[PDB]
């Protein structure tokens with residue numbers, strides 16, 4: 001789930 | 011739905 | 021008027037693994053009709069509306085009942101037939117995931133808050149009086165009955181468990197899980213029908229008919 | 232602590248037909264992440280738990296939002312893209328039944344009770360903090376956050392609408408419909424993917440991946 005992880009990181 | 015109708019009638 | 025005493029009375033009045041589970045479901049459909057007739061004002065709804073409400077709600081209604089029956093069972097459920105079904109048996113029959121949802125989202129949560137029979141009864145009456153059910157001749161009437169049940173439930177919770185201000189909300193917030201679980205159990209049942217190995221008796225089969 | 236003011240602020244901060252609908256869904260997934268970060272304590276959960284909660288709740292979260300956006304629309308919905316989609320268009324695209332469920336069970340009911348943005352925000356936060364989500368490192372922590380939201384919501388309802396003692400329950404009792412509708416919209420989306428005609432953009436597609 002790369003998009004979600006990237007957005008939630010910052 | 012004959013069973014339900016019969017049971018709900020009496 | 022919607023007295024919790026009458027709702028409790030309705031509950032008290034009616035008190036491979038997949039084959040046994042379906043047998044229990046069919047058995048309890050007969051008893052479910054007896055239960056609904058004992059809920060205030062249900063029997064005075066139009067016959068066609070009583071039919072609509074039971075066809076819409078039966079699975080959630082029966083699941084709530086067996087889940088509450090199972091609160092003192094460890095990692096299992098107690099069927100109306102008197103058979104206890106353990107997690108392991110469900111898993112080894114290819115239905116482990118949905119079984120575990122019942123255990124974790126319903127039974128364990130009922131256990132942990134010590135949901136009582138009046139509360140269960142009221143939640144079931146709320147499910148019964150579902151004003152979103154398609155085809156109702158007067159949804160407003162069903163909505164009003166739902167409103168009376170939940171008013172009575174809140175007053176009951178506030179009176180019996182005054183030290184638990186969150187309890188009423190806690191009860192109502194098991195209904196989305198119940199809805200989801202009912203839908204998933206139904207999906208499995210349609211599959212059992214489709215494959216044609218598992219015996220499905222007449223009332224359960226009738227519930228699988230189109231409207 | 233869970234102030235309704237912060238939840239309202241989160242809402243205010245983020246403020247064929249099927250192709251357009253999917254485009255809107257993908258668009259709003261980006262904004263949904265921005266919304267969740269603005270809900271008290273969400274960003275302090277473990278990253279993997281934030282992922283679990285959004286993957287579990289995104290559809291219900293987005294459906295609640297477009298439904299509330301549509302309360303002044305007659306027999307239709309307003310997409311985040313600015314496109315109004317009418318009943319007739321949904322019906323003529325083969326998705327009429329599910330569209331009508333949105334209208335009758337969500338939009339019209341939000342309209343009729345004049346559900347406000349604080350209330351919508353709180354319902355969405357309750358959905359976000361779903362302690363039944365599988366794989367959570369600490370479900371108890373998520374449960375505690377849900378409890379704080381609903382405590383704050385009840386106090387808000389009692390303060391703002393003292394003449395409506397049933398209002399808090401009324402709000403919570405839209406969640407089973409939301410759950411069912413979310414599941415059905417998801418089922419349709421998997422079908423759109425399966426048939427392969429309808430463009431599905433990257434974030435929406437990611438939500439359709441297995442865990």
Ligand SMILES: COc1cc2c(cc1-c1cc(/C=C/C(=O)O)ccc1O)C(C)(C)CCC2(C)C
Nearest residue numbers: 042044045048082086099100115118119205208
């Ligand atoms: C046939 O309906 C089912 C199916 C299941 C399951 C339960 C039921 C079912 C059982 C009953 C039995 C009630 C009772 O014994 O009081 C009523 C409605 C139902 O949908 C559980 C959750 C136990 C396990 C998964 C499956 C899909 C096999």
Ligand SMILES: COc1cc2c(cc1-c1cc(/C=C/C(=O)O)ccc1O)C(C)(C)CCC2(C)C
Nearest residue numbers: 253255256259293297310311326329330416419
């Ligand atoms: C792609 O997700 C859908 C599908 C539908 C529908 C809605 C969505 C959908 C739309 C959005 C759009 C949100 C927005 O515009 O703010 C978000 C999540 C969704 O699941 C409705 C209920 C409008 C009509 C039926 C279908 C199945 C086509």
